[PDB]
Paper text:
The PCDN family is a lineage of antibodies isolated from an individual participant in the International AIDS Vaccine Initiative’s (IAVI) Protocol C, a longitudinal study of neutralization breadth in HIV-infected individuals. The donor in question, PC76, developed a broad serum response targeting the N332-glycan supersite (also known as the high-mannose patch), one of the key epitopes on Env, which involves N-linked glycans and amino-acid residues around the base of the hypervariable region 3 (V3) loop. All thirteen of these antibodies have a cysteine (Cys) residue at position 100 k, which is located at the base of CDRH3. One PTM that has been less frequently discussed in the context of therapeutic antibodies is cysteinylation, in which a cysteine residue in the antibody forms a disulfide with a free cysteine molecule.
The resulting crystal structures of Fabs PCDN-16B and 22A showed that their variable regions (Fv), including CDRH3, resemble the previously published structures of PCDN-27A and PCDN-27B.15 In each case, the CDRH3 loop projects away from the center of mass of the Fab domain in an extended β-hairpin structure. However, each CDRH3 conformation is distinct. The PCDN-22A expression profile additionally shows evidence of a fourth isoform, in which the first four N-terminal residues of the light chain variable region (Glu-Ile-Val-Leu) are also excised along with the signal peptide. In contrast, the structural data did not definitively confirm cysteinylation on PCDN-22A. The crystal structure from the 48,500-Da species, which would be expected to be the cysteinylated counterpart of the 48,381-Da isoform that we solved earlier, showed no electron density corresponding to an adduct on Cys100k. Considering that this method separates protein species on the basis of charge, such that increasing positive charge correlates with longer elution time, this finding indicates that cysteinylation of 16B appears to confer a greater positive charge, while the same modification somehow has the opposite effect on 22A. The reason for this may have to do with the initial charge of the CDRH3, where 22A has a higher net positive charge in this region than 16B and is then shifted by addition of a potentially zwitterionic adduct. Also, the effects of cysteinylation on 22A and 38B function were not tested and could behave differently in these antibodies from 16B.
Numbering used by the authors:
A (entry chain B): 2 to 82, 82A, 82B, 82C, 83 to 100, 100A, 100B, 100C, ...
B (entry chain A): -1 to 27, 27A, 28 to 94, 96 to 213
Amino acid sequence: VQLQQWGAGLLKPSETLSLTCAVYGESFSAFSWSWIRQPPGKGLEWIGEVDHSGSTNYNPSLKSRVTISVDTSKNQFFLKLVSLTAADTAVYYCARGGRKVYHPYWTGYVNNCFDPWGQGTLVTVSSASTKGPSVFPLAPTAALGCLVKDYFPEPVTVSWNSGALTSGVHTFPAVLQSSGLYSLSSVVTVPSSSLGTQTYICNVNHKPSNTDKRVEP
Amino acid sequence: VHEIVLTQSPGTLSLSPGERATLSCRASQSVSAKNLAWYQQKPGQAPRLLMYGVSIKNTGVSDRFSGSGSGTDFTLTISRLEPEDFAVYYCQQYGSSPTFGQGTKVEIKRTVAAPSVFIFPPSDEQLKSGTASVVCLLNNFYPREAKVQWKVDNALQSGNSQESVTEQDSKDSTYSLSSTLTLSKADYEKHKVYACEVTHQGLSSPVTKSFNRGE
């Protein structure tokens, strides 16, 4: 059993998210199929489920905006989320739910736990366009760093002294600002006596925009 | 249609290898039959079905995992913790419309370490750019729980600061935090004194780092 996932992963607010999950290997019917999402650094949230007959069930938090459809001709099922906001940025997984069980007196789905899972599609909702980062020095055991602000999209690679200085380096995760762009900080702790003799340069490379900052006391 | 809220305890379980871990899942209303599951998620990976039917392990799951409980109280037990087991664990109920718990992190335990607090004012180039960012850095601390408060001329600021935290390091098993306070150039040049106050378990008294505009 294999799950393939696709769909646009970079959208603007007040737009429609459309994702597709295709299953290979076993019988697409006799199984519930669910969409789940996970915001970056947060917990799992069940979005919805569908079966082969087209009957759906949704999370009450997303009932107004979510629509889950099915296509048994292609063994696929689709997710649609209208009126997007920054709160909808998340990794979206599809998963196989429970098995349909038939008895002459009762029929229903049992063991509605999720396995296997799709690879997961990251979706980012923001009105920002591709912009290069601005690198500002955070001047000074002494701590010193570089602030990488106003860039889009992820990621950005940060090194120190062309990769020489690696111990004591802390590169935090990027934060999505309200403006739609990202901000980041890279810091490093050094001996106080090296501040006068040794030079410190943060090498910041953002390949989406194809864009070395010296930090001075 | 039946809505069931699952709360996991504790939020963070700090244990050492070789010990046993006990995670609890409380349901606001009874979970029917044995319709509960546990999932394991490692950093930057897809969730993994760990257990279903309260106590039935999935294929390829070691004997060190055990499930128990019923009604509103459920438990996941890890007999001997391995370096692999340190991750996030979620409980999920499927007695009604499926719902997830908020998750419990099993992490490496170490000695309490106090953070080193530093403050960075905005660079003059950034001031000319039209925005100001003040950075408050908390370096090497344990446990993760720490409180950062911004004060601009003794005024408590809210809604204009953003935090970021690194994952527990592989060597010293510590955390690092950064709090960025973002202002406009006018709002920044209006006031003068900027401070961040850090409260932590390792600090006997809240440590405040401040600077005056133009220093």
